[PDB]
Structure formats: structure tokens, C-alpha cells
Tab-separated table of C-alpha atoms and ligand atoms in Angstrom:
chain	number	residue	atom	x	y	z
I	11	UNK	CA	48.870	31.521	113.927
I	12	UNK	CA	52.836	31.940	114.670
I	13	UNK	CA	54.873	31.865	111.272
I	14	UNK	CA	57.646	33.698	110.480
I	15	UNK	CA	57.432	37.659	109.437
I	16	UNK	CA	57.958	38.241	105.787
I	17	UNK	CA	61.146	40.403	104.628
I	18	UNK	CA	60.767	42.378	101.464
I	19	UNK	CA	64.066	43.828	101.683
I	20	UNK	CA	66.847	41.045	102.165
I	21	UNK	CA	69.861	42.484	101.088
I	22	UNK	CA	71.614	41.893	104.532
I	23	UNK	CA	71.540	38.533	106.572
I	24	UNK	CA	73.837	37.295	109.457
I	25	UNK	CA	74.331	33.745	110.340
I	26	UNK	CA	74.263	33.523	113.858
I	27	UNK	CA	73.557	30.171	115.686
I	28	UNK	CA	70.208	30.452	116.515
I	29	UNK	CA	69.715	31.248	113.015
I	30	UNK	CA	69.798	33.776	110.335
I	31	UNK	CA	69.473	37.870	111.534
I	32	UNK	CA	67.809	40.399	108.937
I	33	UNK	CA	66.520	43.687	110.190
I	34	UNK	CA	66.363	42.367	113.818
I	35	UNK	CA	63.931	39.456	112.925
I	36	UNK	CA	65.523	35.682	113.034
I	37	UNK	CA	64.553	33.686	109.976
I	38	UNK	CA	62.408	36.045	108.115
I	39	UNK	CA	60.744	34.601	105.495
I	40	UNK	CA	62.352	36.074	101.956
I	41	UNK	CA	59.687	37.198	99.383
I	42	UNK	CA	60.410	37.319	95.466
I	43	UNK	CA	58.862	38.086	92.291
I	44	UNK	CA	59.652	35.614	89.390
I	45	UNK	CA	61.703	37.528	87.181
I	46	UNK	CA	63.179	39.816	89.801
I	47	UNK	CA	66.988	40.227	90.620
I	48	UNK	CA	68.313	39.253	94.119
I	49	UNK	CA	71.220	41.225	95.531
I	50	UNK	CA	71.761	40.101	99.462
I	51	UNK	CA	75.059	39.869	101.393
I	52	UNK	CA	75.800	36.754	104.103
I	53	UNK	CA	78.060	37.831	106.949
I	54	UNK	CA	79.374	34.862	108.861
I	55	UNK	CA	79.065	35.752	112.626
I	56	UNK	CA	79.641	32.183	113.539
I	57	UNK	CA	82.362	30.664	115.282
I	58	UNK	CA	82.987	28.086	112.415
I	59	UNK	CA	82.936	28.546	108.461
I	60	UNK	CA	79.541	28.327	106.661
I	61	UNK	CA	77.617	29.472	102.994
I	62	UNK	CA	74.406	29.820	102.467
I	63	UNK	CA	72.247	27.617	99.970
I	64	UNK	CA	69.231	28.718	98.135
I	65	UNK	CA	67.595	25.765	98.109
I	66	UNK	CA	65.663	24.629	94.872
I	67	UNK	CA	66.339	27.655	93.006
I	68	UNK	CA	67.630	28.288	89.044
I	69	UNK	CA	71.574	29.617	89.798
I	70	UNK	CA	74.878	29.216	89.040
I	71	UNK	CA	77.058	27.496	91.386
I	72	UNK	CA	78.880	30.637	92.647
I	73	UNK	CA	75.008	31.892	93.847
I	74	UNK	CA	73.850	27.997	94.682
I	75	UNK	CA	76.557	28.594	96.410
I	76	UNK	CA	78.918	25.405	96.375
I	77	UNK	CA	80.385	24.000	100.016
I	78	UNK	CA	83.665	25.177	98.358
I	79	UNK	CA	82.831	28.529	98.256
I	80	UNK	CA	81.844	28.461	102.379
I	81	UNK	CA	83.600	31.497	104.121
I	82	UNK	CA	85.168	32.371	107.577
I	83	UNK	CA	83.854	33.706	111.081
I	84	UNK	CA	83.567	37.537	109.826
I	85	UNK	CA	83.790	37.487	106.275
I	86	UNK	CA	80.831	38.413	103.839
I	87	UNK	CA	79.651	36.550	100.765
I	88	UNK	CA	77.335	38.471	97.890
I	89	UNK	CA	74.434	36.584	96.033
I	90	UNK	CA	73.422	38.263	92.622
I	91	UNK	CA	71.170	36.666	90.205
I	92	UNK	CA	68.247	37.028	88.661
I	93	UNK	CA	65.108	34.643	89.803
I	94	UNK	CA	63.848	32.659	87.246
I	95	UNK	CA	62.250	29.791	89.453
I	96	UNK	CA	58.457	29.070	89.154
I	97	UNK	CA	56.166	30.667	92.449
I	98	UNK	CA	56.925	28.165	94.806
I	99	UNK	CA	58.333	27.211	98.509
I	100	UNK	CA	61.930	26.678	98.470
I	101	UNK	CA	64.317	27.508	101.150
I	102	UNK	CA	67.730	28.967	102.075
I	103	UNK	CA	69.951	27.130	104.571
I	104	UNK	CA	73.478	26.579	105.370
I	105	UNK	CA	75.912	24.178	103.198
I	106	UNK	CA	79.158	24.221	104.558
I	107	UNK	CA	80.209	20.763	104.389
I	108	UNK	CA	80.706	18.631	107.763
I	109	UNK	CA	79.057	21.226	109.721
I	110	UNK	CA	75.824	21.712	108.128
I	111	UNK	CA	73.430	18.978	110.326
I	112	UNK	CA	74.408	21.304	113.495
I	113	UNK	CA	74.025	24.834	112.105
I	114	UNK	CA	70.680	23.867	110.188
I	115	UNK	CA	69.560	21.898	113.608
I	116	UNK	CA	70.466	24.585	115.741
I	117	UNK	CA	68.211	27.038	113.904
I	118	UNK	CA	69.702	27.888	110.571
I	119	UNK	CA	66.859	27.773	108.043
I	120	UNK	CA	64.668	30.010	106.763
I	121	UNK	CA	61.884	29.815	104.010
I	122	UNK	CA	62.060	31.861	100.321
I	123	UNK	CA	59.134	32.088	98.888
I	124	UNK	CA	58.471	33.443	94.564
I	125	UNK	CA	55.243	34.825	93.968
I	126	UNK	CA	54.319	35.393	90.021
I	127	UNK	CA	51.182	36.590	88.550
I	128	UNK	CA	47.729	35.197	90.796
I	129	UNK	CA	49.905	32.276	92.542
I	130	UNK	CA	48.596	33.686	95.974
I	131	UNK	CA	45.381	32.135	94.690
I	132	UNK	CA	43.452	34.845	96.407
I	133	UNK	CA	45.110	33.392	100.103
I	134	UNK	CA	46.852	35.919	103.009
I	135	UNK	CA	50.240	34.938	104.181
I	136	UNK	CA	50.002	34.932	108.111
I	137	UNK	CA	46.268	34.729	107.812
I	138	UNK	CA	45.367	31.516	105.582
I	139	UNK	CA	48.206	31.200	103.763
I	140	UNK	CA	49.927	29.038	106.603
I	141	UNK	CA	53.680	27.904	105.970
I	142	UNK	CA	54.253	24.864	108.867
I	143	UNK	CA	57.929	23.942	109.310
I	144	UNK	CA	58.011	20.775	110.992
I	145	UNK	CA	61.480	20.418	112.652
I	146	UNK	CA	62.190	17.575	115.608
I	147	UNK	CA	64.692	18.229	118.291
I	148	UNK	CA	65.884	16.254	120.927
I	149	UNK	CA	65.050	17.902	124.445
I	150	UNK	CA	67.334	17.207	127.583
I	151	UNK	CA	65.964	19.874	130.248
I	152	UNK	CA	63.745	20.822	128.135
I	153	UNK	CA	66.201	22.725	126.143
I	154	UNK	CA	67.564	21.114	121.948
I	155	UNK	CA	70.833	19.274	122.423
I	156	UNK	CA	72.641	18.059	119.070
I	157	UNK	CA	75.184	14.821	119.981
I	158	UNK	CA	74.652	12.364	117.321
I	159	UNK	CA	76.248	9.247	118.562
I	160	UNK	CA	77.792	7.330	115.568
I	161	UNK	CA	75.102	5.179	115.103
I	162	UNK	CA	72.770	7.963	114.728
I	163	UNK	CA	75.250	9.426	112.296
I	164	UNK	CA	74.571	6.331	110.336
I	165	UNK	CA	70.687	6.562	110.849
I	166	UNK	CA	69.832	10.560	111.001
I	167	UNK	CA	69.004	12.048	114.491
I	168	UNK	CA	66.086	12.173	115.973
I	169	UNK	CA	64.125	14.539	118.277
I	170	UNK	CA	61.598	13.670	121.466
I	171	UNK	CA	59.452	16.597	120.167
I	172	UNK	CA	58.056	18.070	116.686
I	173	UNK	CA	57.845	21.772	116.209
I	174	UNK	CA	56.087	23.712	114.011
I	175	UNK	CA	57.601	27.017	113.393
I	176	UNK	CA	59.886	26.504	115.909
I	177	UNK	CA	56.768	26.460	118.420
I	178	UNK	CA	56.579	23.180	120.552
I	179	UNK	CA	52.486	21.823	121.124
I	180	UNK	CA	51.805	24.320	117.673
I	181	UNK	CA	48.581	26.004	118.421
I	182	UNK	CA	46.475	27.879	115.558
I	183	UNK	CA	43.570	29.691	116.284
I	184	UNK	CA	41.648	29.938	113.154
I	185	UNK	CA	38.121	31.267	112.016
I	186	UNK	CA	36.345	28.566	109.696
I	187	UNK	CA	36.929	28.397	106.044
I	188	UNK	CA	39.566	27.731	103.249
I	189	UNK	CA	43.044	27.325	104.097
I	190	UNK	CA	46.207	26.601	102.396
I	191	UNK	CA	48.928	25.844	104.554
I	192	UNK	CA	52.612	25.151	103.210
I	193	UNK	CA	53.920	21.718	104.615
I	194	UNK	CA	57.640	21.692	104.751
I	195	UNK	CA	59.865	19.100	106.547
I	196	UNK	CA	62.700	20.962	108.319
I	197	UNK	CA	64.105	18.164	110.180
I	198	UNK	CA	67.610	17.019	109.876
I	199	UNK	CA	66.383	13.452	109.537
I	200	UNK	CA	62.920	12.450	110.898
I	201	UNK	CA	60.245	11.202	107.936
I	202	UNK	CA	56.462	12.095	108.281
I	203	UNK	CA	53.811	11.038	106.818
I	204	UNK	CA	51.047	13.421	107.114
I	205	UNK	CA	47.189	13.570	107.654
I	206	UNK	CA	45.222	15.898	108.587
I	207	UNK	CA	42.089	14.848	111.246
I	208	UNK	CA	39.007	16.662	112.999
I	209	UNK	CA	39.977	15.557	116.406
I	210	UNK	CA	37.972	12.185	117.415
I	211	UNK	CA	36.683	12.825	114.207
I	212	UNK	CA	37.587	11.440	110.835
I	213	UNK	CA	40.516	12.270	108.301
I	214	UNK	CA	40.136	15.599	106.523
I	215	UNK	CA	41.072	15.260	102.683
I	216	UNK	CA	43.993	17.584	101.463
I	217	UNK	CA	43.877	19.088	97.964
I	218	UNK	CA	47.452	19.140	97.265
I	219	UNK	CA	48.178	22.251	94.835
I	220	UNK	CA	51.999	22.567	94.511
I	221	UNK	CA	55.309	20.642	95.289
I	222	UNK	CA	59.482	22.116	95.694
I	223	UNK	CA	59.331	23.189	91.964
I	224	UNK	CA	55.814	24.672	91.996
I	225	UNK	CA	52.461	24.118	91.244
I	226	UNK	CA	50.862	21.069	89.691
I	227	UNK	CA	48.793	20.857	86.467
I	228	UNK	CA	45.622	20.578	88.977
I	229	UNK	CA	44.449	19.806	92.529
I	230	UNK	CA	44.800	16.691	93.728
I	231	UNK	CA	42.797	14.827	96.831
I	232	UNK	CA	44.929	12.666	98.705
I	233	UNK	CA	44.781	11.760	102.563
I	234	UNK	CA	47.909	11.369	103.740
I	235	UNK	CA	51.094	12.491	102.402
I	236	UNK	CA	54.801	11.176	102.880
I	237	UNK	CA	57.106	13.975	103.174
I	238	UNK	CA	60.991	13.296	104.094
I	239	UNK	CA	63.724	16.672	104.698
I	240	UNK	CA	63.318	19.272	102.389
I	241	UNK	CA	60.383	18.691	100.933
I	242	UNK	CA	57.488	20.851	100.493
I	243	UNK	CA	54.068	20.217	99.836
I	244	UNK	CA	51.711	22.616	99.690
I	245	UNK	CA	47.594	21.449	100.033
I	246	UNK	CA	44.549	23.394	100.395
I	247	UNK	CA	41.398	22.125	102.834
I	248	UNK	CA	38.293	23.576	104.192
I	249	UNK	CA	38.298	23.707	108.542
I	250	UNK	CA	34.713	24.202	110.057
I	251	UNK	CA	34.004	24.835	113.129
I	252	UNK	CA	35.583	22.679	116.082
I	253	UNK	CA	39.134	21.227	116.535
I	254	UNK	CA	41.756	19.727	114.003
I	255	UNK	CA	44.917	18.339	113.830
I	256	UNK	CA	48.218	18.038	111.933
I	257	UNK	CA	49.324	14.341	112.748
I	258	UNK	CA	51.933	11.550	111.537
I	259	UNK	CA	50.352	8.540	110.951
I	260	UNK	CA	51.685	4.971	111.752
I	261	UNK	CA	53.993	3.912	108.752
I	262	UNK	CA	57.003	1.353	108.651
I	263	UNK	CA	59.911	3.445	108.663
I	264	UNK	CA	62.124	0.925	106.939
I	265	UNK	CA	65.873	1.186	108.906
I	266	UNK	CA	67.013	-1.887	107.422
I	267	UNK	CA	70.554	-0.565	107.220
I	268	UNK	CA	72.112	-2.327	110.368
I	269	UNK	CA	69.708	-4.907	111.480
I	270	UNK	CA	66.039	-3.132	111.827
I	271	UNK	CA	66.862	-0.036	113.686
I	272	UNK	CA	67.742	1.201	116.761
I	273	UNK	CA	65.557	2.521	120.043
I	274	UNK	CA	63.684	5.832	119.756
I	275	UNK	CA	62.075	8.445	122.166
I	276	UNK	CA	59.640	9.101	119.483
I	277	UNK	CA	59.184	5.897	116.783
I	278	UNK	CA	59.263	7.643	113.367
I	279	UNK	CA	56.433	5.676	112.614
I	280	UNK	CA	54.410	6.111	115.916
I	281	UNK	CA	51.049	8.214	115.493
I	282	UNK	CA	51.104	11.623	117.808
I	283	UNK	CA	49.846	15.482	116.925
I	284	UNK	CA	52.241	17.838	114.938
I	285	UNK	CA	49.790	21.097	115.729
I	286	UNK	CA	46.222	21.642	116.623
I	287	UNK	CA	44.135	23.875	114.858
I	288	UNK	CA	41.199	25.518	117.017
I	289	UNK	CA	38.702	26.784	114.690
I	290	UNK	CA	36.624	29.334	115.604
I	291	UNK	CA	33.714	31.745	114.159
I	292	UNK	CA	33.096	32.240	110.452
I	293	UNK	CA	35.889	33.215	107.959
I	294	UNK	CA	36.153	33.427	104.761
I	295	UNK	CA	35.959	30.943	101.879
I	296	UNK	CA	38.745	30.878	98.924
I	297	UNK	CA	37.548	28.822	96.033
I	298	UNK	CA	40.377	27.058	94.710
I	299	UNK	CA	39.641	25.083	91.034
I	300	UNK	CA	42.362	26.354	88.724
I	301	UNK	CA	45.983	26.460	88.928
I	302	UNK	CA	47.116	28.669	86.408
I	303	UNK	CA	50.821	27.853	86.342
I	304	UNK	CA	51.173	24.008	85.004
I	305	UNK	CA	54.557	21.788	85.165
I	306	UNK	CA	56.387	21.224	81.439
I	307	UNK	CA	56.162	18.185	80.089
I	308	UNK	CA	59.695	16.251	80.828
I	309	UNK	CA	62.273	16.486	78.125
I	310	UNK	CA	63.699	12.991	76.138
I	311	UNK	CA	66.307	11.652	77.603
I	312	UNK	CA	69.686	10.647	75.444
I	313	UNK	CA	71.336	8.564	78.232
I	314	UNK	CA	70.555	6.268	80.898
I	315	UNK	CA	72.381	6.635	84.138
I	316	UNK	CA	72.250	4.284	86.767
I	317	UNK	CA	73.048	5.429	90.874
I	318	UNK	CA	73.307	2.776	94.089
I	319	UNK	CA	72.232	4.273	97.307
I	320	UNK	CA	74.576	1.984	99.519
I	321	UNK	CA	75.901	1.713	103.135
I	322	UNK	CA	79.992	0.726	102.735
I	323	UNK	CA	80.675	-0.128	106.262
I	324	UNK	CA	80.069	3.131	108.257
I	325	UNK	CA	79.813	5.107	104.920
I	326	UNK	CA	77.041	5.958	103.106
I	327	UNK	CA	77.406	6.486	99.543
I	328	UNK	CA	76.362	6.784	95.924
I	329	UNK	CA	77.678	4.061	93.140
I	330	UNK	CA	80.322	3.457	96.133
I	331	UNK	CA	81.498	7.002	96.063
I	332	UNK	CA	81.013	9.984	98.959
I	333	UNK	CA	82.856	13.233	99.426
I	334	UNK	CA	86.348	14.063	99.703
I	335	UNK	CA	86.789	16.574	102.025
I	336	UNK	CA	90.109	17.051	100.816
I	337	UNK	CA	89.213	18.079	97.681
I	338	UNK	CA	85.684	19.868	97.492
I	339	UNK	CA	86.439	20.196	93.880
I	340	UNK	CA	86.483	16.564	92.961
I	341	UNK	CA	84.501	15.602	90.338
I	342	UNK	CA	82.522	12.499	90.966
I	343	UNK	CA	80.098	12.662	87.721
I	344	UNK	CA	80.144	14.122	84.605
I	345	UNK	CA	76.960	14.781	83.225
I	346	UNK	CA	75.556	16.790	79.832
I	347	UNK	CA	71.992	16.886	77.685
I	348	UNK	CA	69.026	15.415	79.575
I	349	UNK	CA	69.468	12.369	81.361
I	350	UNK	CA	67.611	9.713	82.780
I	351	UNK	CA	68.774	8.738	86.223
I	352	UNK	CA	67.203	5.273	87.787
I	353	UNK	CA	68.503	5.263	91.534
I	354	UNK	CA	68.110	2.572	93.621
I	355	UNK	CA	68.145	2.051	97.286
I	356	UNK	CA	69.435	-0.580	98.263
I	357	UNK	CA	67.203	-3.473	100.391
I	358	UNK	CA	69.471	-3.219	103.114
I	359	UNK	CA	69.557	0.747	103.567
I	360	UNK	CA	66.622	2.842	104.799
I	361	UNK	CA	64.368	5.617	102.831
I	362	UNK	CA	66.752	8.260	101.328
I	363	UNK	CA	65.595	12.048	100.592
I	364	UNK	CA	67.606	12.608	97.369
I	365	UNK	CA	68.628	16.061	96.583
I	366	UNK	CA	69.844	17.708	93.111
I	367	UNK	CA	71.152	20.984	92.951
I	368	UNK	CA	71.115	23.822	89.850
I	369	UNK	CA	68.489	21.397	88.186
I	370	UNK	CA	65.188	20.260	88.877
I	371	UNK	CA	63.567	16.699	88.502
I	372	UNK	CA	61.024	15.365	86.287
I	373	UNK	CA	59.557	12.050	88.346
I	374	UNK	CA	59.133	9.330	86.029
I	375	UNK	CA	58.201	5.881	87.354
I	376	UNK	CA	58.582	4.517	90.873
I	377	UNK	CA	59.078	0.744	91.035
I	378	UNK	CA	59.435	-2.055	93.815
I	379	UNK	CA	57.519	0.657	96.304
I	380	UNK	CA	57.254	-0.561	99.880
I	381	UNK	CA	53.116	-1.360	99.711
I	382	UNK	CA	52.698	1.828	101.733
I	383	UNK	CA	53.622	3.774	99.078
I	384	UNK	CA	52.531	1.695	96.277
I	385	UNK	CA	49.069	2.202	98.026
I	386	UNK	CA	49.046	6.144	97.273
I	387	UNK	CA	50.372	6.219	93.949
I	388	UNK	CA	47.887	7.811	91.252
I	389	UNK	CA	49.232	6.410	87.834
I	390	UNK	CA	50.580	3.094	86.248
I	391	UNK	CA	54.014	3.899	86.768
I	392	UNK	CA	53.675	3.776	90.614
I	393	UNK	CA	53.744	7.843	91.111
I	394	UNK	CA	52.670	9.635	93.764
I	395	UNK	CA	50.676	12.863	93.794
I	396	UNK	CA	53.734	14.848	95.166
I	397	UNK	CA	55.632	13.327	92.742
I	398	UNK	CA	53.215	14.729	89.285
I	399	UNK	CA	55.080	17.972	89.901
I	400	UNK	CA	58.365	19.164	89.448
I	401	UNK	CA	60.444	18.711	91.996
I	402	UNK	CA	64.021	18.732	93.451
I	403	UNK	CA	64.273	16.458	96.535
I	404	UNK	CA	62.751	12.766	96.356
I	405	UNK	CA	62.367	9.862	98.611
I	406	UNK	CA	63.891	6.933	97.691
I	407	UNK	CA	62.580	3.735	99.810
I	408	UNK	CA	64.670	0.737	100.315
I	409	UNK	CA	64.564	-1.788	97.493
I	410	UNK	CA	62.865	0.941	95.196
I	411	UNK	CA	63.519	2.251	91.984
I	412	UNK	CA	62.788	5.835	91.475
I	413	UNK	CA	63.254	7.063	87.535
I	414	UNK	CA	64.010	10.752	87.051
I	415	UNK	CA	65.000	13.115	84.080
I	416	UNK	CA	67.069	16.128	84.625
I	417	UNK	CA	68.140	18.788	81.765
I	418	UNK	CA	71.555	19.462	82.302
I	419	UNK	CA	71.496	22.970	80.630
I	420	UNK	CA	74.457	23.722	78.446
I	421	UNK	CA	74.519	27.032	79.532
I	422	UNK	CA	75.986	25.797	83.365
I	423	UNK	CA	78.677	24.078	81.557
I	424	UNK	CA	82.123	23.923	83.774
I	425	UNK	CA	80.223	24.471	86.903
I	426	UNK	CA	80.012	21.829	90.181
I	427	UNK	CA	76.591	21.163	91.208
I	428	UNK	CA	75.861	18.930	94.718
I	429	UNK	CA	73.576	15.466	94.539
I	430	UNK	CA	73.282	14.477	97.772
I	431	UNK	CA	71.108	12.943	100.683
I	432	UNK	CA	68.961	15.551	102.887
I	433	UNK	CA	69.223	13.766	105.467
I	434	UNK	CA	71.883	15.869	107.401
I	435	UNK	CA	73.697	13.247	109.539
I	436	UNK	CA	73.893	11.480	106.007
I	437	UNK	CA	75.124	14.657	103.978
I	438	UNK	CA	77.630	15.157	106.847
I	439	UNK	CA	78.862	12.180	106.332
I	440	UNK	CA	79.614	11.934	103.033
I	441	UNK	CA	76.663	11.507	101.561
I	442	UNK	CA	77.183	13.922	98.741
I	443	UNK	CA	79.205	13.762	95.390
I	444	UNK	CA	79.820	16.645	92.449
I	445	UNK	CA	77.924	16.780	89.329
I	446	UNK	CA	80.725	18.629	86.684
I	447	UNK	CA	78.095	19.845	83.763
I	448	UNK	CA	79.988	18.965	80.357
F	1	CU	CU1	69.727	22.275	97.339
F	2	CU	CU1	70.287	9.309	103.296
């Protein structure tokens, strides 16, 4: 069971380009308490600027931190806030803006994890608590080369291989029992849509327990679960005895946005294994019934804001407008009070992983779903089970609608927050505006 080692003590961290160095060990995963004060230094060892982003979390924009802020090869940068998120999986990656795809793709990323009072739900971290980072890369001698072409900057790059953990042909060797295993997508581009099979068996159901923003108000069965860049879903499920396995299923991965897509070493919606999972022996059993940490309801929105996911020629942008790299500052939207925002992809475009920083999203109604996801929705207003928690990074499918309501808290007033796509090619390109808070 290969995940990364925990780190208690992360007041030190180098970027370095096979990823971030704390006390020897490359990517640790970072530990918190809700409540608790963080107080780490970033020391660029890099050849090329960079900042570090805390992914999901509750901060101002000078601990977010904004692209703006990135600093030089040899220079440090100091994070101090206190952590007020719920217990959750979020992450911490680089931002720096134009170079971000490569760093993160090269192995920048690492996962943060809050812990608050019985969210462990009675599960061991390296022993069934099992976080599986799914990252692509593109082999060429059997080593990752990055050299998006500028059609794939247009449609997000794409491996030949999935990893898990950074561990090609995952293996787990597990006893049988409960297991909750922490699904995030760390690829720069590549969509999933995830089941969960006894091998030449049938599909094991997944009681999905908590989202980016935390847990949901209670366990919910689903089979297969969409999950784009950045997102995190975490599910609980009960292995016997015998083999398993982590798999993408066959979906239609929509890349309507020049013609229908271009040729792929691995189809994004071909089915193949993500891990295996030998289970062996007897282990122990972790009822899971009550989550004890529900999502607020979602405030009333005051004003309605509409956003256009649209591809301007070879640009990608939002309501026609995309970053200026000459002025990091600029600022695109000005925003105050809670707001509804209704973005929609356009028809000719392909499925969009929406990202908001400082604030999280309340998912309201999804409408004009591709029948795929239409199919999994739970409620009336076309929602998904990933999408009944809180969250912070949604997919947005071409032609659909997707409602959400964000409280722009007064107290970040003056302060530059990033909305942008997760997919990386797309954020390097432009894909990402400011949000000034008013
Ligand atoms: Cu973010
Ligand atoms: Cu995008």
C-alpha cells in the first residue's frame, strides 16, 4: 500500500523539480488540525520562478498565495495563517503563472490533509485510510516527457500511462474489510470516471463520504464517479477476499472544441485498470453510518452573475476574457455579498474543471447534462452526489449549465482571488481571470 509519508512538522519545504523536499521525504503529505496555525517557509530551488498554492483552503490572498506573489530561483516565501477549513483533502501545488502545467506535471504536488474531532472515522492512514493520486504521464523510453504541442495546449495533455501515487501498474496488498480510500485526480488534464470492480466480477458500490470542502450530510451509494483535475472524492467500500480493481469506465469525453478531438495513446474514455487491489486474509471491519460534520445550508444570493466558458480562436477564456500576463494585477471581476454564478460551457468546447479560489462553492442545479451525467444525478435539479457537498473545483460539460453560490466574505475585501480552469494546459494558457472582492 505505497502512499506518501505523513509530515507533522512542515515548517520547511523546497521546490525542487521532482517535487516538493521536507525533511528528506518528496511530497510528504501535510497533516492539520482545524483550528490550528500554519507557519511553513517555501524556498524556490528551481531554475524558474514559482509560489506555492494551498489548494481549497480558507486564506487570504498573500497565504493563497496569488501568481503575483511567485518568487525567484533562491528566494523564500512564509505562509502564516490560521486553518479554519473543514477536515478534508485539499492540496498544495505550484501557481506561478505560465509555468505551472510543467512544474505540477513534473512532480510538484503534494496532498494537505485537516483532521477535526472523529473525522478519521475510526480509519488508519497508510493502512485503510488509502489516499490514490491518479496522475497520467506521457512515457517515451519509458521515462515522463512534457511537450505539449499547440493543439494539446488547446485540449490538455495526455499521458500513455495512469499512476497512482506516482507508482505505475499500482499494486495494494490488502487484508479483507472496510476501506476508505481518498480519490484525487492529479492529472494536468485527463478526466476519469471511476468504478470500482472485483476482477471478472461485478461493480463494487462506493459509499461516497466527503468531497474538496469536506464531508457530506450522509453516505451516499453510487457506482461510478466522474472526477476531472483537482477534485477529490473520498468513498468508503468493503473488499473481501480475492482481487479488485480501480478502473475508468467507457464515457464520451466530449472534445468538441476543434472538430471532435484529436488521436490519443490512451482514449480518455477507453476502459483500462488504474490499480489492483489484492486482498488477502481477514482484517478488520470499520462501520461507517454517521458523518458527524454536515455541509451548511447555501446562503441567498443578491445577484445573478452569468460566465461563458469559450474557445476565441486559440484562446480559451471566460465571458471573452483570459489573463494578462502583463499585468497579474488586473482585475477582471468585481464581486461582493453572495452571488449566484450560472456558467456555461459552451456546445462547441469540451468538459471544463472550474476552480475558485479563497471561497468555496455551494452546487445548485446542473442543467442541459450530457445523458451520462444526467444518468447519475440524485435530485431534481440534475445534481450529482459529489456535487451535495461543498466544494471548490466543478466540472462543467459542454452545453451545460452548472448554478453555484459563493459568499464573497466582506472581511477579504481589496484582495485578488484566481477563477480559473484546472486543466493546466488551459490555466497556462490563459485560462484564468481575477476576482477583486468589493
Ligand atoms: Cu485553488
Ligand atoms: Cu478548461
Amino acid at each position: 500500500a505505497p502512499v506518501p509519508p505523513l509530515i507533522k512538522e512542515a515548517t520547511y519545504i523546497e521546490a525542487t523539480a521532482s517535487g516538493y523536499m521536507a525533511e528528506g521525504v518528496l511530497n510528504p503529505t501535510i497533516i492539520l488540525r482545524r483550528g490550528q496555525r500554519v507557519d511553513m517557509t517555501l524556498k524556490n530551488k528551481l531554475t524558474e520562478p514559482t509560489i506555492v498554492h494551498w489548494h481549497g483552503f480558507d486564506v487570504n490572498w498573500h497565504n493563497d498565495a496569488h501568481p503575483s506573489f511567485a518568487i525567484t530561483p533562491g528566494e523564500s516565501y512564509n505562509y502564516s495563517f490560521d486553518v479554519v477549513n473543514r477536515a478534508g483533502t485539499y492540496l498544495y501545488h505550484p501557481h506561478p503563472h505560465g509555468l505551472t502545467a510543467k512544474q505540477f506535471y513534473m512532480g510538484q504536488l503534494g496532498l494537505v490533509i485537516v483532521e477535526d474531532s472523529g473525522s478519521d472515522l475510526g480509519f488508519k492512514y497508510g493502512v485503510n485510510d488509502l489516499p490514490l493520486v491518479i496522475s497520467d504521464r506521457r512515457f517515451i523510453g519509458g521515462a515522463p516527457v512534457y511537450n505539449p504541442t499547440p493543439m494539446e495546449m488547446i485540449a490538455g495533455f495526455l499521458g500513455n500511462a495512469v499512476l497512482v501515487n506516482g507508482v505505475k501498474d499500482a499494486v495494494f496488498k490488502l487484508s479483507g474489510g472496510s476501506y476508505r480510500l481518498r480519490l484525487v485526480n492529479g492529472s494536468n488534464a485527463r478526466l476519469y470516471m471511476l468504478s470500482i470492480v472485483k476482477k471478472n466480477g461485478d461493480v463494487v458500490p462506493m459509499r461516497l463520504i466527503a468531497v474538496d470542502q469536506g464531508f457530506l450530510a450522509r453516505p451516499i451509494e453510487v457506482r461510478a464517479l466522474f472526477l476531472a483535475p483537482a477534485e477529490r472524492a473520498e468513498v468508503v467500500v468493503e473488499l473481501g477476499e480475492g482481487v479488485y480493481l480501480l478502473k475508468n469506465t467507457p464515457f464520451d469525453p466530449m472534445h468538441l472544441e476543434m472538430g471532435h478531438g484529436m488521436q490519443e495513446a490512451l482514449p480518455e474514455g477507453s476502459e483500462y485498470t488504474i490499480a489492483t487491489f489484492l486482498v488477502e486474509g481477514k482484517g478488520e471491519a470499520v462501520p461507517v453510518e454517521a458523518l458527524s460534520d454536515p455541509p451548511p445550508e447555501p446562503p441567498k444570493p443578491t445577484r445573478t452573475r452569468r460566465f461563458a466558458l469559450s474557445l476565441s480562436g486559440m484562446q480559451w477564456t471566460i465571458n471573452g476574457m483570459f489573463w494578462n500576463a502583463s499585468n497579474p494585477l488586473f482585475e477582471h471581476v468585481s464581486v461582493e455579498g453572495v452571488e449566484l454564478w450560472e456558467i456555461v460551457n459552451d456546445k462547441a468546447s469540451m468538459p471544463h474543471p472550474m476552480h475558485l479560489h479563497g471561497f468555496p462553492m455551494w452546487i445548485i442545479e446542473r442543467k442541459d447534462s450530457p445523458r451520462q451525467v444526467a444518468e447519475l444525478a440524485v435530485d431534481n435539479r440534475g445534481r450529482l452526489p459529489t456535487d451535495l457537498g461543498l466544494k471548490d473545483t466543478v466540472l462543467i460539460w459542454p452545453g451545460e449549465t452548472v448554478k453555484i453560490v459563493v459568499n464573497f466574505d466582506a472581511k477579504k475585501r481589496g484582495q485578488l482571488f484566481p477563477f480559473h480552469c484546472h486543466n493546466l494546459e488551459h490555466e497556462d494558457g490563459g485560462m484564468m481571470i481575477n476576482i477583486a472582492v468589493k
